[PDB]
Design a protein around this ligand. Structure first.
Ligand SMILES: *[C@H]1O[C@H](CO)[C@H](O)[C@H](O)[C@H]1NC(C)=O
Ligand SMILES: *[C@H]1O[C@H](CO)[C@H](O)[C@H](O)[C@H]1NC(C)=O
Length: 7
């Protein structure tokens, strides 16, 4: 799994 640009 991955994650979207955390900002
Ligand atoms: C996590 O990042 C990867 C990089 O290709 C994919 O874009 C994936 O779809 C992402 N997962 C989510 C939940 O956005
Ligand atoms: C997505 O979020 C996760 C958890 O915070 C990680 O920081 C990961 O490095 C993030 N992905 C991107 C592409 O920044």
């Amino acid at each position: 799994p991955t994650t979207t640009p955390l900002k």
